[PDB]
Design a binder for these strands. Structure first.
Lengths: 159, 103, 58, 218
RNA sequence: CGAAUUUGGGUAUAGGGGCGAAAGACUAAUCGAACCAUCUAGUAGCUGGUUCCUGCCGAAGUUUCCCUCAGGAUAGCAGAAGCUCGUAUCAGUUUUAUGAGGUAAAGCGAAUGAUUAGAGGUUCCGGGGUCGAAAUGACCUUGACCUAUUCUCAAACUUUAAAUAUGUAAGAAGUCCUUGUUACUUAAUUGAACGUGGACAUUUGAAUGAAGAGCUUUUAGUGGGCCAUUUUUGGUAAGCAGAACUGGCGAUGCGGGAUGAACCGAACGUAGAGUUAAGGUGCCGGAAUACACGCUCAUCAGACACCACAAAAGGUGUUAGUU
RNA sequence: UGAUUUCUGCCCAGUGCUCUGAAUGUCAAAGUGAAGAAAUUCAACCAAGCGCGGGUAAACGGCGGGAGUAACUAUGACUC
RNA sequence: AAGACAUUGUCAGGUGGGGAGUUUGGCUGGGGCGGCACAUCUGUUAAACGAUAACGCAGAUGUCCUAAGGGGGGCUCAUGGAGAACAGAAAUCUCCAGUAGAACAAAAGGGUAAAAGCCCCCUUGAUUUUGAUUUUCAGUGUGAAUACAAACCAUGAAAGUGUGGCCUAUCGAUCCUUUAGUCCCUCGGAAUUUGAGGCUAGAGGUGCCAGAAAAGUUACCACAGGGAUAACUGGCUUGUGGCAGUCAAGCGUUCAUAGCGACAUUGCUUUUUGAUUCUUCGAUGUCGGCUCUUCCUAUCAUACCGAAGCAGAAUUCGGUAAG
RNA sequence: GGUUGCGGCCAUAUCUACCAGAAAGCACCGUUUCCCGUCCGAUCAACUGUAGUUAAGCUGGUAAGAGCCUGACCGAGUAGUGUAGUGGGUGACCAUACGCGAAACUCAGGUGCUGCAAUCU
RNA sequence: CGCGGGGUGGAGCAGCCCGGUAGCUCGUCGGGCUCAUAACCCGAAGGUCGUCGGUUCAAAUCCGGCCCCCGCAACCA
């Protein structure tokens, strides 16, 4: 008979770590999550209450509720031909903030700084990001760097 | 299993509304009374010709019944029922478990 | 007379015909499932805010 | 009596070793992996000749034993026993299942067909890849031709395509012959009973000095 | 073939009944339940058929439940009717930033399990031999056991660990001063949530595209699938059985593979011209008995994927290649 | 069952059939007493049956293993 | 003669295949036997998000626990070394080493070291109310439950912890019966009591586990269909059957391959039997024999040859060769 | 800079051996009247900091130390892998084209940093 | 009309973690016996552990054209 339990096929996924077993460091309990914060889900195998499902393992959501030792996270899950909004009551041990959102907020603050600078003098700030442009022309010297000619090597057993 | 004869639990008896001592007993199904509406209808349907008129179960699979404890509050004599998981053996008299004894 | 048991063939195509478009988001999401203590406090705070705003712009 | 290695040739299945789930497999037909003077030294036998595979296939334990016996017998007959050391470098760990069928009448009525067709072990094989060493013969340049011919006979016994390569390393070590020569004229190399011990630039100096005395005092 | 005989006529036995020296036999060519009419146009998830044209759109053999497995409901795919709204809250795509993974690989002088070989020291029980009448007074073995160790491995082993896939974010529902409200919270006008006042334009905060975003109702058919290339399970294997992603056939003609549902090209209104794709240019057959370099002579040559088969081994046949 | 001839061995444990009742057995309607305000409980060798007993196989039917044992060996008259 | 007994009528118990009606699961490499892949859980198939099949692999569940639930405190476990009279390989005591190699009810996988293990103390949060949420999912239900809220408690000095078992399995609709709960609502001409029916939560059960009330046989058989599916041929495959190669350890009285030839290995064959279910169930007449023709060669004989352990004579091996 | 109390990251912090430690900052103790707990003031509890050592817990330093971290144009653009072909090959598998890209090995370096408060020749 | 769970010898059995370096019951008129004698009984003991080739580091217990107990066919509808 087939087996599809709550923690089915979660052996290595919920495997704790290598040389990171045991108690958890208290930074995780010290972190503060407010409503609207984007957070990453990585289940902790040593904590068994508030554990997320293996589907939500590795997903990212928005905090919508805060409780004593937990946080309500909203995840859009693809069910068939649409995403449904699932609400999870996860614990702070399993939950973790989003460096991507932190970086975006830092970029927003910087962007505002450059716009203020432009309003100060207007030096064509170009707020937006640009992709990797093709490299322009350059002149490379040969003094001290005379080209060393290479040739394909003959085959040898090397055993 | 073994369950104590006395139990301190919540009593919603309009006077207690708080935890209180309860005498614990096993719930008995009670006698299936005649003159219930279902029994009257069954007797009317069975009377006459035609034979059996309703299903008779035969495919019994469970070897256990869910033990239900009736708790009588010592304060207001209010009764509360709570079911337990299926257990082949059940006991109300409490012979406490002895840990460091031989045999 | 055995038959095919299960397959995921054609399922993604059927989904993507008119499918995986994102769900629509709202300002002021539903306050259901949030802490009822916070709900009571937010109700009272909103009532007071409306009263104060009406007083400010009579 | 035994189904052909033609049927059990290619690496079709995942590795299926004897484990706590198999728990019932027969013993390999090849149990001995070193022949000749295995007590010899890397100083004694400098030259290494390898019989390697050019295919990605499986060699049965029976084929391994046949090739081993043939090569060892030819070497002993022509050059004597105390002239070579032959080591087979592949171990049969992949067990092979067989779904036994009935060769009788009424078989179509009392055979059940492909229902429950999972098989039980009846043999073992080693899964070799391209360039994997199958046989290694450590010997001298006066026995180079003899060991080449013995490995040719083992190749005849083996399935698939095999090459015979004159290794540029010193015997069974992993060092080229000039490098071993220089280390041995120096003192980073010192002989054990069969293989050789090497001196490390890192470690406990007093432990190296209570060992490796020649390199320091030479 | 003188009788348990054969037979006419008249009688009796009538359908779940009769009759049967017994065959389920006979009972008006009907018998393991006659015939006639009616209930009755009995029911059928099962066969067969289901009648004009054109135009536009256009599938499914999949999810869950069902005495469900030749069938239904349900969701999905499709049509129709539209509604609110003008360059939209978007995307089978990429980039930047940030997560998750334990598969490929790799590893086993790293854990677990498997496994080859030594050597060194073996004296905390074990075996025999030689010093041969005394114990930890000696050596060779098993090795109560460390290495410089060493050869191989793992779908239900692993420190490490890809590629492809995969979750988010890239702002106006945003960013900064007033904390205005609170019955929540704080030792505290401390925080939390919501908000009033103010500042931010043609780089409103990456690329590319957008064929108009978004939304509702209702309903058909379907719920036997099959076949490539990759991943992959059982099996000796199968034009076998079973899964994953994608693309196809079903439902689809067309050019090519002579022929073929799936392969290669390419998808289709009616015509004309030009150019090609795949495939080809000796003749069948439209197009070079082209051009250039070699190799091959078969008393079963070889001739273009899917594909319509061939191996180990061998041959101074011939050709070309370290010492 | 199937002339004549000669026989029809053992088994009533089981399933049947059959035969009087010992009665801490089971025991329906109707009847008899408690209680209740009235519809709503026990007692009766309870009747027959069932169960408990006795017969019956020319009723349906059934009719077993292992081992050790004898002066070549073999078997087992014998024994457990 | 018999007699208030027979008989007759009604009700009640028994007997009653003599007769009547009906039923006699599903999956399934055809059915049947077997098994449960039918409701579930662990690891792996499973191809590093999720999902993912087979009568795949290795297993497990329908239980058990007033503690094996809850809180607090203290200690560290499995092993190994050394030591102590009986006492020794194993009895109790004491040090040292000890990343867990122990234990945690069970099956497996995770998880846990001033603990989640062992011991000690208290205890019933395995309590009440109805919401929200995750998992299979249609985002339906059952099973578990993650986080709160309003109470009442337990424990601890306190922070806190506790809504059963460290987590992943350990289970059950309508109808009926039964019990608990402001004795609340109704018995409809007005009422008091008994009784009955209601509201909200449990239990009595459906293991085919979204839940029918259920024995066979048909060789006397019938119907609707099915090549969705077995018994022929044919088709793929060749395990198996048959035949043929390669290598050479040996056999051949010293003298490997005259003739054989172990261990191994490479094939061919559709004259065996399996595997499969593609065609045929609105029928392709089914074993054998007789008769008759043709074809294949893997040649038994006949023609011509080569090689022998060919002397001659029989023979053996092989070549052309199916006339 | 040493030390203590509370810590953050949780071995660059651990483990083996040895050497060093002024002054401050746990010590054997004097102790068991009281609080408290054990077979045992050994652990725990409690009162004196007084006669007294750097014992050495602790810290620091040293080992061609083990381990553990950090790198590399070392291994190695190798194993593997996405995409493509009417590519090779009987096949097994292999090469190429557009990309991504390991681990083990081999060298080299390092052997705790840091926050709050208090205190110290 | 196959192939196997084992052949020690006139009747049978290997400490199966594949270094078998010398095991158990039979004959034996030996011992005694109220039948000049019968049932009965401590002990000297033959097998390289089935004719032969390869594992052959020392080893003929593994593979092979010997019949058997058994399971599922004198093969075909």
């Amino acid at each position: 008979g087939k087996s599809h339990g709550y923690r089915s096929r979660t052996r290595y996924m919920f495997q704790r770590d290598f040389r990171k077993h045991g108690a958890v460091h208290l930074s995780t309990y010290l972190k503060v999550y407010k409503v609207g914060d984007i957070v990453d889900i990585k289940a902790n195998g040593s904590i068994q209450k508030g554990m997320p499902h293996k589907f939500y393992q590795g997903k990212t959501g928005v905090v919508y509720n805060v409780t004593k030792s937990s946080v309500g996270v909203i995840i859009n899950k693809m069910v068939g031909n649409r995403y449904l909004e699932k609400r999870l009551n996860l614990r702070v041990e399993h939950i973790k903030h989003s460096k991507c959102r932190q970086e975006f907020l830092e970029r927003v603050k910087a962007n505002a700084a450059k716009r203020a600078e432009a309003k100060a003098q207007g030096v064509a700030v170009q707020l937006k990001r640009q992709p990797a442009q093709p490299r322009e022309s350059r002149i490379v010297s040969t003094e001290g760097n005379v080209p060393q000619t290479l040739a394909p090597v003959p085959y040898e057993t090397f055993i | 299993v073994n369950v104590p004869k006395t139990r301190k639990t919540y009593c919603k008896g309009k006077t207690c509304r708080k935890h209180t001592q309860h005498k614990v007993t096993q719930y008995k199904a009670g006698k299936a009374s005649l003159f219930a509406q279902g029994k009257r209808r069954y007797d009317r349907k069975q009377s006459g010709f035609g034979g059996q008129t309703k299903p008779v179960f035969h495919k019994k699979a469970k070897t256990t019944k869910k033990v239900v404890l009736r708790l009588e509050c010592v304060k207001c004599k209010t009764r509360a029922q709570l079911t337990l998981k299926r257990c082949k053996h059940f006991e109300l008299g409490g012979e406490k478990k002895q840990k460091g004894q031989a045999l | 007379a055995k038959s095919k048991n299960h397959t995921a063939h054609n399922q993604t195509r059927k989904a993507h015909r008119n499918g995986i478009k994102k769900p629509k988001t709202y300002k002021y999401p539903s306050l259901k499932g949030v802490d009822p203590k916070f709900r009571r406090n937010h109700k009272h705070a909103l009532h007071g805010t409306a009263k104060a705003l009406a007083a400010a712009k009579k | 009596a035994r189904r052909p290695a033609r049927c059990y040739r290619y690496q079709k299945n995942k590795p299926y070793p004897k484990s706590r789930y198999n728990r019932a497999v027969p013993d390999s037909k090849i149990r001995i992996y070193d022949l000749g003077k295995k007590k010899a030294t890397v100083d004694e036998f400098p030259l290494c000749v390898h019989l390697v595979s050019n295919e990605l296939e499986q060699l049965s334990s029976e084929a391994l034993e046949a090739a081993r016996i043939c090569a060892n017998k030819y070497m002993t007959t022509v050059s004597g026993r105390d002239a070579f050391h032959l080591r087979v470098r592949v171990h049969p760990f992949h067990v092979l299942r067989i779904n036994k069928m009935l060769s009788c009448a009424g078989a179509d009525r009392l055979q059940q067909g492909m229902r429950g067709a999972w098989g039980k072990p009846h043999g073992l094989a080693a899964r070799v890849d391209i360039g994997q060493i199958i046989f290694s013969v450590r010997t001298k340049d006066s026995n180079k031709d003899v060991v080449v011919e013995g490995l040719r006979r083992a190749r005849y016994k083996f399935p698939g395509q095999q090459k015979i390569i004159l290794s540029k390393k010193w015997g069974f070590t992993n060092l080229d012959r000039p490098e071993y020569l220089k280390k041995r004229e120096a003192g980073e190399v010192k002989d054990d009973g069969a293989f050789v011990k090497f001196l490390s630039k890192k470690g406990s100096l007093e432990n190296n000095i209570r060992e490796f005395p020649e390199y320091f005092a030479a």
